[PDB]
Symmetry: C2
Subunit: 49 residues, 2 copies
């Protein structure tokens, strides 16, 4: 037996991203995540998108 | 006796702006106000920064 995933994942956009989409045409994933790490100064995020 | 302000009112950058300044060369003042009133769907805004 193998414990394979049973469901497709999802990647819902954050509302803050939508303001950054309407203006300049670019989107970085998890915009709230980077904001909380620049304040602490930590460079290594736990996870990526 | 005209009532004139006794002190300069300093502007301050929002923490959300700190990532936007790095990822691209632009800043939207009151960026949290844009996200709040855009997610609300209301075309108008209270006051400018």
């Amino acid at each position: 037996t193998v414990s394979a995933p049973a469901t497709y994942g999802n990647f819902v956009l954050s509302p803050e991203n939508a303001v950054t989409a309407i203006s300049y045409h670019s989107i970085l994933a998890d915009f709230n995540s980077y904001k909380a790490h620049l304040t602490s100064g930590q460079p290594h995020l736990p996870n990526d998108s």
